[PDB]
Amino acid sequence: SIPHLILELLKCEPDEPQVQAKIMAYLQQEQANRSKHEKLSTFGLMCKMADQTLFSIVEWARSSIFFRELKVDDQMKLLQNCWSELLILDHIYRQVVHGKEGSIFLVTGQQVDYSIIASQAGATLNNLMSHAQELVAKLRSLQFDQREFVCLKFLVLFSLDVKNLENFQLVEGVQEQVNAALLDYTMCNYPQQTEKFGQLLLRLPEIRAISMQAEEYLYYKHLNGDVPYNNLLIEMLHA
């Protein structure tokens, strides 16, 4: 029993295999480009993955119901507010749906041992990765599903905390409606877990916090000369 609204949300979803392929191809064709002099690091590679995932998120957003009806200035304010949250949310959902504990399912579509990434990384990034891991675990135990995921994505995108929106009413309207649809979906589909609606919404502040930490850390990395040229990621980071 899936509300109508949620069906409209699911129709907006990307083709995940094609996205994975596109990014993967971009990264190969990048070594081709790069001279046999210039080398690249695990951190650097992950920055490129984030950058390419951002292109895909913007594409998803621009074609999505409701978001299409906004003026581009409003679209920009919404995306500038939530880009890092959408990256994190997308990551988390992949871990739950196509991943397993002890492994990271990357956006290029392969799994790598968590250990093998974490070992490359210093303590600040490890700390962030751990918190993300706990979110994944929490949401795994909740039996987080695709219908829930799409609702949370719209709730993140159509944020109420964004000031200076022209059409703030449409944005409020979307929040309320997705909220109501999520409430329906959980009571209809998970009737013995009346806590499920609440447990889902309370992940959103945690996602917001991890995302703000990620950005602060990445800006440090950028100012340190550690982020390879990455137009969209850094343009978003400068927002």
């Binding site: 581009v72 500038q80 137009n231």
Partner: peptide, 13 residues
């Protein structure tokens, strides 16, 4: 503000 974000949103596919 971001020329690039604007472009990614406006471009006609």
């Amino acid at each position: 503000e971001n020329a690039l974000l604007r472009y990614l949103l406006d471009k006609d596919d």
